[PDB]
Design an enzyme around this catalytic site. Structure first.
Site, PDB file in Angstrom:
ATOM      1  N   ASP A  21       3.111  15.988  10.968  1.00 53.27           N
ATOM      2  CA  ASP A  21       3.459  15.484   9.643  1.00 53.27           C
ATOM      3  C   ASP A  21       2.247  15.515   8.709  1.00 53.27           C
ATOM      4  O   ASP A  21       2.053  14.649   7.868  1.00 53.27           O
ATOM      5  CB  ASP A  21       4.096  14.093   9.714  1.00 53.27           C
ATOM      6  N   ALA A  62       9.765   2.210   6.824  1.00 51.56           N
ATOM      7  CA  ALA A  62       8.507   1.496   6.983  1.00 51.56           C
ATOM      8  C   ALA A  62       8.015   0.983   5.632  1.00 51.56           C
ATOM      9  O   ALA A  62       8.223   1.605   4.579  1.00 51.56           O
ATOM     10  CB  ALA A  62       7.409   2.411   7.648  1.00 51.56           C
ATOM     11  N   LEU A  78       0.813  -1.204   0.000  1.00 49.86           N
ATOM     12  CA  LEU A  78       0.000   0.000   0.000  1.00 49.86           C
ATOM     13  C   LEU A  78       0.847   1.255   0.000  1.00 49.86           C
ATOM     14  O   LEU A  78       0.397   2.328  -0.442  1.00 49.86           O
ATOM     15  CB  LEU A  78      -0.903   0.046   1.236  1.00 49.86           C
ATOM     16  N   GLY A 101       7.841   4.254   3.441  1.00 50.99           N
ATOM     17  CA  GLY A 101       8.684   5.396   3.716  1.00 50.99           C
ATOM     18  C   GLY A 101      10.085   4.895   3.981  1.00 50.99           C
ATOM     19  O   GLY A 101      10.396   3.743   3.741  1.00 50.99           O
ATOM     20  N   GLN A 102      10.934   5.757   4.507  1.00 51.41           N
ATOM     21  CA  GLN A 102      12.341   5.418   4.667  1.00 51.41           C
ATOM     22  C   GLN A 102      12.559   4.213   5.552  1.00 51.41           C
ATOM     23  O   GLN A 102      13.395   3.383   5.240  1.00 51.41           O
ATOM     24  CB  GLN A 102      13.121   6.607   5.225  1.00 51.41           C
ATOM     25  N   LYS A 131       1.690  -2.067   8.942  1.00 52.90           N
ATOM     26  CA  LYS A 131       2.838  -1.173   8.830  1.00 52.90           C
ATOM     27  C   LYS A 131       4.029  -1.790   9.565  1.00 52.90           C
ATOM     28  O   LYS A 131       4.035  -1.925  10.791  1.00 52.90           O
ATOM     29  CB  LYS A 131       2.506   0.214   9.422  1.00 52.90           C
ATOM     30  N   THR A 170       8.854  17.418   6.322  1.00 50.42           N
ATOM     31  CA  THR A 170       9.098  17.709   4.901  1.00 50.42           C
ATOM     32  C   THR A 170       9.117  19.214   4.704  1.00 50.42           C
ATOM     33  O   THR A 170       8.123  19.883   5.066  1.00 50.42           O
ATOM     34  CB  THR A 170       8.020  17.059   4.035  1.00 50.42           C
ATOM     35  N   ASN A 187      -0.028  11.742   3.708  1.00 51.54           N
ATOM     36  CA  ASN A 187      -0.470  11.284   5.015  1.00 51.54           C
ATOM     37  C   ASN A 187      -1.936  11.443   5.305  1.00 51.54           C
ATOM     38  O   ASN A 187      -2.384  11.461   6.444  1.00 51.54           O
ATOM     39  CB  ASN A 187       0.396  11.871   6.137  1.00 51.54           C
ATOM     40  N   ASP A 190      -0.320   8.124   9.479  1.00 49.51           N
ATOM     41  CA  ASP A 190       1.082   8.431   9.737  1.00 49.51           C
ATOM     42  C   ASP A 190       1.303   9.234  11.010  1.00 49.51           C
ATOM     43  O   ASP A 190       1.577  10.441  10.975  1.00 49.51           O
ATOM     44  CB  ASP A 190       1.788   9.074   8.566  1.00 49.51           C
ATOM     45  N   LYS A 236       0.317  16.366   5.592  1.00 49.07           N
ATOM     46  CA  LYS A 236       0.627  16.573   4.182  1.00 49.07           C
ATOM     47  C   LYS A 236      -0.203  15.566   3.381  1.00 49.07           C
ATOM     48  O   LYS A 236      -0.697  14.568   3.914  1.00 49.07           O
ATOM     49  CB  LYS A 236       2.087  16.514   3.867  1.00 49.07           C
ATOM     50  N   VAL A 243      -7.257   1.971   4.881  1.00 49.54           N
ATOM     51  CA  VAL A 243      -7.912   3.054   4.171  1.00 49.54           C
ATOM     52  C   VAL A 243      -7.601   2.752   2.692  1.00 49.54           C
ATOM     53  O   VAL A 243      -6.466   2.827   2.290  1.00 49.54           O
ATOM     54  CB  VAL A 243      -7.481   4.438   4.598  1.00 49.54           C
TER      55      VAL A 243
END
Ligand code: ADP
Ligand code: MG
Length: 276
Positions: free
Chosen positions: A138, A24, A18, A21-22, A41, A179, A143, A160, A140, A95
């Site tokens: 976080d 996960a 799905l 990230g760096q 996750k 970010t 997320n 997230d 954005k 989700v």
């Protein structure tokens, strides 16, 4: 705390990836005992104390603790946690409609109603979190997840919780930096942070929703950060000519350097662009 150390594969089957990230990776999964589906996750553990690879146990447990607290239609919940020597595995509410980021890439420019339909949901989720003294830190479009992307006004959940903190003193002063395009000036300047930083991010997301453009984005990350700190943004007529003045007022009152002068989440919900 310790987590369930039976092999997650004895209890779940995994499928599609799905996202990631760096440190996960998130896999769709199905619980054998119920047939219900989740998002697993997998967070990579640190192998030593002094390592920069993986996520510290303290940081993993903070995410888990915050997730366990929360239950609201506009946030994901936590179902179970497993662990083994390499990963902690958070079984999260699925989700299934993809990231807001991908929706906005694929779709034509939003109407002001479509932007406020997404924003209002974000506001309601953030109101819940801030009521609990939880700063997300976080916010954005990658997320934020859509339940179903093939309806006119998609419903959303915030995901997230990897940077989220409880703010019991009004600010925190840990190592927190997300970010560049979304972070508040106080993050850029390494100052104590509080709930106000999320309100800035909401201003940036609103600008994106309405225009398709990012207000502070420069050609490099250092340029973006310099722009954030200086509050170097403007509403380009090409993008905002058929956007209302009240929508711009809403953004203007969020993209404020002094966190004390920035709208709070309560203010945002009572602002005349949003309030019924
Ligand atoms: N509950 C979820 N349901 C569906 N997809 C998810 C869920 N949680 C995360 N994802 C996907 O995985 C990505 C990475 O997960 P995230 O929690 O954002 O970790 P990271 O801290 O590494 O960004 C997300 O951007 C999203 O695409
Ligand atoms: Mg993420």
């Amino acid at each position: 705390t310790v987590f369930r150390q039976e092999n997650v594969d004895d209890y779940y089957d995994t499928g599609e990836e799905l996202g990631s990230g760096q440190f996960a990776v998130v896999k769709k999964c199905r619980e054998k005992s119920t047939g219900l589906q989740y998002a697993a996750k997998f967070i990579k553990k640190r192998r030593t104390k002094s390592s920069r690879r993986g996520v510290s146990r303290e940081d993993i447990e903070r995410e888990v603790s915050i997730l366990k607290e929360i239950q609201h239609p506009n946030v994901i919940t936590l179902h179970e946690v497993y662990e083994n020597k390499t990963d902690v595995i958070l079984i999260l509410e699925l989700v299934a409609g993809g990231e807001l980021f991908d929706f906005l890439a694929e779709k034509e420019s939003l109407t002001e109603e479509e932007a406020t339909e997404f924003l209002k949901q974000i506001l309601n989720g953030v109101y819940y979190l801030h009521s609990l003294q939880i700063a997300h830190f976080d916010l954005k479009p990658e997320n934020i997840m859509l339940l179903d992307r093939n309806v006119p006004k998609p419903r959303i959940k915030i995901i997230d919780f990897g940077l989220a903190h409880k703010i019991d003193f009004g600010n925190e002063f840990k190592n927190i930096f997300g970010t560049p395009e979304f972070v508040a000036p106080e993050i850029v300047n390494y100052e104590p942070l509080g709930l106000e930083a999320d309100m800035w991010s909401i201003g940036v997301i609103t600008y994106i929703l309405l225009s398709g453009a990012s207000p502070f984005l420069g050609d490099t990350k250092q340029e973006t950060l310099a722009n954030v700190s200086a509050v170097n943004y403007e509403f380009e007529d090409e993008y905002f000519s058929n956007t209302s003045a009240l929508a711009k007022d809403f953004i203007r009152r969020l993209l404020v350097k002094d966190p004390k002068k920035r709208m709070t989440i309560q203010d945002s919900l009572q602002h005349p662009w949003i309030k019924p």
